[PDB]
Design an enzyme around this catalytic site. Structure first.
Site, PDB file in Angstrom:
ATOM      1  N   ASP A  21     -74.773 -16.302 -31.254  1.00 21.90           N
ATOM      2  CA  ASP A  21     -73.927 -17.305 -31.941  1.00 21.90           C
ATOM      3  C   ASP A  21     -74.103 -17.605 -33.139  1.00 21.90           C
ATOM      4  O   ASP A  21     -74.146 -18.922 -33.491  1.00 21.90           O
ATOM      5  CB  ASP A  21     -74.090 -18.562 -31.133  1.00 21.90           C
ATOM      6  CG  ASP A  21     -73.658 -18.489 -29.577  1.00 21.90           C
ATOM      7  OD1 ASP A  21     -72.178 -18.749 -29.423  1.00 21.90           O
ATOM      8  OD2 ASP A  21     -74.191 -18.050 -28.733  1.00 21.90           O
ATOM      9  N   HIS A  23     -72.298 -17.399 -35.892  1.00 24.27           N
ATOM     10  CA  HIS A  23     -71.064 -18.117 -36.481  1.00 24.27           C
ATOM     11  C   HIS A  23     -71.149 -17.626 -38.040  1.00 24.27           C
ATOM     12  O   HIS A  23     -70.762 -18.368 -38.769  1.00 24.27           O
ATOM     13  CB  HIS A  23     -71.148 -19.373 -36.414  1.00 24.27           C
ATOM     14  CG  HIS A  23     -70.440 -19.817 -35.022  1.00 24.27           C
ATOM     15  ND1 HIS A  23     -69.467 -20.410 -35.027  1.00 24.27           N
ATOM     16  CD2 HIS A  23     -71.093 -19.901 -33.723  1.00 24.27           C
ATOM     17  CE1 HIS A  23     -69.293 -20.555 -33.494  1.00 24.27           C
ATOM     18  NE2 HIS A  23     -70.281 -20.247 -32.731  1.00 24.27           N
ATOM     19  N   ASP A  65     -70.940 -15.651 -30.289  1.00 25.45           N
ATOM     20  CA  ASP A  65     -70.132 -15.631 -31.349  1.00 25.45           C
ATOM     21  C   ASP A  65     -70.734 -15.391 -32.691  1.00 25.45           C
ATOM     22  O   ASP A  65     -71.210 -16.450 -33.580  1.00 25.45           O
ATOM     23  CB  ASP A  65     -69.390 -17.009 -31.437  1.00 25.45           C
ATOM     24  CG  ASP A  65     -68.535 -17.413 -30.256  1.00 25.45           C
ATOM     25  OD1 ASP A  65     -67.640 -16.673 -29.634  1.00 25.45           O
ATOM     26  OD2 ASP A  65     -68.858 -18.101 -29.478  1.00 25.45           O
ATOM     27  N   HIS A 101     -63.056 -12.478 -28.789  1.00 23.65           N
ATOM     28  CA  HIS A 101     -62.318 -11.789 -29.868  1.00 23.65           C
ATOM     29  C   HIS A 101     -60.659 -11.863 -29.791  1.00 23.65           C
ATOM     30  O   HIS A 101     -60.429 -11.466 -28.446  1.00 23.65           O
ATOM     31  CB  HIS A 101     -62.750 -10.471 -30.169  1.00 23.65           C
ATOM     32  CG  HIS A 101     -62.864  -9.661 -29.203  1.00 23.65           C
ATOM     33  ND1 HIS A 101     -63.636  -9.480 -28.353  1.00 23.65           N
ATOM     34  CD2 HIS A 101     -61.709  -8.330 -29.094  1.00 23.65           C
ATOM     35  CE1 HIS A 101     -63.142  -8.477 -27.162  1.00 23.65           C
ATOM     36  NE2 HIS A 101     -62.114  -7.817 -27.964  1.00 23.65           N
ATOM     37  N   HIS A 223     -72.525 -18.157 -26.153  1.00 27.50           N
ATOM     38  CA  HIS A 223     -71.380 -18.747 -26.290  1.00 27.50           C
ATOM     39  C   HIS A 223     -71.794 -20.300 -26.394  1.00 27.50           C
ATOM     40  O   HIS A 223     -71.127 -21.146 -26.991  1.00 27.50           O
ATOM     41  CB  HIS A 223     -70.256 -18.843 -25.255  1.00 27.50           C
ATOM     42  CG  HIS A 223     -69.357 -19.733 -25.325  1.00 27.50           C
ATOM     43  ND1 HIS A 223     -68.434 -19.745 -26.059  1.00 27.50           N
ATOM     44  CD2 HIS A 223     -68.771 -20.856 -24.493  1.00 27.50           C
ATOM     45  CE1 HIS A 223     -67.348 -20.450 -26.052  1.00 27.50           C
ATOM     46  NE2 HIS A 223     -67.896 -21.209 -24.705  1.00 27.50           N
ATOM     47  N   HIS A 225     -74.221 -23.232 -28.128  1.00 26.86           N
ATOM     48  CA  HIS A 225     -74.987 -23.412 -29.336  1.00 26.86           C
ATOM     49  C   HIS A 225     -76.371 -23.863 -29.343  1.00 26.86           C
ATOM     50  O   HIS A 225     -77.195 -23.763 -30.130  1.00 26.86           O
ATOM     51  CB  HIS A 225     -74.152 -24.363 -30.381  1.00 26.86           C
ATOM     52  CG  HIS A 225     -72.808 -23.833 -30.901  1.00 26.86           C
ATOM     53  ND1 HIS A 225     -72.008 -24.661 -31.635  1.00 26.86           N
ATOM     54  CD2 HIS A 225     -72.306 -22.939 -30.480  1.00 26.86           C
ATOM     55  CE1 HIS A 225     -71.067 -23.966 -31.984  1.00 26.86           C
ATOM     56  NE2 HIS A 225     -70.963 -23.066 -31.145  1.00 26.86           N
TER      57      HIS A 225
HETATM   58  N1  LIG Z   1     -63.327 -16.545 -31.501  1.00 21.49           N
HETATM   59  C1  LIG Z   1     -64.167 -15.555 -31.709  1.00 21.49           C
HETATM   60  N2  LIG Z   1     -65.452 -15.425 -31.653  1.00 21.49           N
HETATM   61  C2  LIG Z   1     -66.103 -14.451 -31.750  1.00 21.49           C
HETATM   62  O1  LIG Z   1     -67.292 -14.193 -31.592  1.00 21.49           O
HETATM   63  C3  LIG Z   1     -65.390 -13.419 -32.279  1.00 21.49           C
HETATM   64  C4  LIG Z   1     -65.539 -12.268 -32.612  1.00 21.49           C
HETATM   65  C5  LIG Z   1     -66.816 -11.302 -32.634  1.00 21.49           C
HETATM   66  C6  LIG Z   1     -66.502 -10.024 -33.225  1.00 21.49           C
HETATM   67  C7  LIG Z   1     -67.875  -8.940 -33.093  1.00 21.49           C
HETATM   68  C8  LIG Z   1     -68.919  -9.806 -32.615  1.00 21.49           C
HETATM   69  O2  LIG Z   1     -69.945  -8.936 -32.629  1.00 21.49           O
HETATM   70  C9  LIG Z   1     -69.048 -10.866 -32.190  1.00 21.49           C
HETATM   71  C10 LIG Z   1     -67.981 -11.844 -32.161  1.00 21.49           C
HETATM   72  S1  LIG Z   1     -63.793 -13.968 -32.309  1.00 21.49           S
HETATM   73 MN   LIG Z   2     -67.987 -18.053 -27.418  1.00 25.63          MN
HETATM   74 MN   LIG Z   3     -70.509 -20.357 -29.865  1.00 30.27          MN
END
Ligand SMILES: N=C1NC(=O)/C(=C\c2ccc(O)cc2)S1
Ligand SMILES: [Mn+2]
Ligand SMILES: [Mn+2]
Length: 331
Positions: A21, A23, A65, A101, A223, A225
């Site tokens: 996560d 971000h 994420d 993604h 996913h 936090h």
């Molecule tokens: N709404 C989204 N959240 C993500 O984590 C997205 C892409 C992502 C792409 C590669 C990766 O290693 C982790 C997340 S897109």
């Molecule tokens: Mn997520």
């Molecule tokens: Mn998240």
């Protein structure tokens, strides 16, 4: 020396770094006072990477994420991601379970990159994948990504639920065919979370924690936090994010997790704290003379970011965001 994996006879231990996560690319509070989180975020990641190196982990798991932007990540964000991915790969094989993604660029990239390297694996589907860890340990991965067409399939809650469950049963059976260790990786909201759940503005996948294949040695989730230890058997964990994204995460602990597995023993883990900037919300009825004193005094030497919440206007507010560079939101 050399810089490939070691091969140790009858080694029945596995050291894991699990982080999630990130971000990468986030700017917070854009509607009140935008703050680019990049510098704070990279400090945290450096701390995580240095811990990994010190502990000489065998495998690095990335869930959740990693990028903030769903469909349009900036070049800077991408560059930081790939940069940090390389750094980890220098330490230990990396297994990545991508989040929700949109852009299809990721799937081609992930597959190609996985095909040409023995130190990074992208798990983009429900298919299990065997990987080799730093000291030669064979590890079976059971991935549970966000389902692609089924969330938008509009199939009834019953059939969708049954689809998910059948997917988990398959993972269970595949875990039984394990050589050495098996690790589950998933990206979803565990049923009845309190209170990182009930999050809005995003399509959610709810999974009862009892349905996580009980014969895995570890269940790496992402996913959410906030760090959560969901259950002990199988040890199931959300690492949480590395920075406090917004003020609902004021009371959170942020970091990564180190996990040790030994075949005849129970799993043990230590939290690796990212020690990110603190957040604080100050509450008032009205911003009166007492409240101004309270605000100014608190923010003065507070090292993190501050929100003020109040109920009613009562005259023209002084330029508080001017005198206090720490104050990022007065709603
Ligand atoms: N709404 C989204 N959240 C993500 O984590 C997205 C892409 C992502 C792409 C590669 C990766 O290693 C982790 C997340 S897109
Ligand atoms: Mn997520
Ligand atoms: Mn998240």
């Amino acid at each position: 020396i050399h810089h490939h994996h070691h091969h140790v006879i009858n080694l029945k231990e596995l050291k894991i770094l699990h982080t999630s996560d990130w971000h990468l690319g986030v700017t917070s509070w854009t509607s009140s006072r935008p703050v680019d989180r990049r510098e704070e975020l990279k400090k945290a990641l450096d701390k995580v990477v240095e811990e990994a190196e010190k502990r000489e982990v065998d495998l690095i798991l990335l869930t959740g994420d990693l990028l903030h932007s769903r469909n349009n990540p900036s070049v800077v964000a991408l560059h930081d991601l790939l940069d940090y991915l390389k750094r980890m790969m220098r330490t230990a094989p990396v297994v990545v379970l991508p989040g929700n993604h949109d852009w299809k660029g990721l799937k081609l990239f992930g597959n190609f990159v996985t095909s040409i390297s023995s130190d990074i694996t992208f798990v983009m589907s429900f298919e299990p994948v065997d990987v080799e860890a730093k000291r030669g340990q064979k590890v079976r991965i059971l991935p549970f990504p966000y389902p692609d067409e089924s969330e938008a399939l509009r199939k009834n809650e019953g059939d969708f639920r049954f689809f998910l469950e059948s997917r988990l049963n398959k993972l269970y059976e595949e875990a039984l065919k394990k050589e050495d260790f098996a690790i589950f990786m998933g990206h979803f909201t565990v049923e009845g979370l309190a209170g990182y759940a009930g999050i809005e503005q995003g399509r959610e996948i709810i999974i009862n924690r009892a349905l996580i294949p009980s014969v895995v040695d570890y269940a790496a989730l992402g996913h959410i936090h906030s760090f959560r230890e969901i259950q002990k058997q199988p040890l199931t964990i959300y690492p949480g994010s590395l920075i406090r994204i917004d003020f609902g995460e004021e009371a959170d602990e942020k970091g990564a997790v180190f996990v040790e597995l030994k075949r005849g023993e129970p799993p043990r883990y230590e939290r690796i704290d990212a020690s990110p900037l603190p957040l604080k919300t100050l509450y008032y009825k009205k911003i009166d003379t007492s409240a101004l004193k309270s605000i100014r005094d608190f923010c003065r030497n507070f090292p993190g970011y501050v929100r003020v919440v109040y109920e009613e206007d009562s005259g023209i507010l002084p330029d508080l965001m001017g005198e206090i560079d720490n104050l990022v939101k007065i709603e």
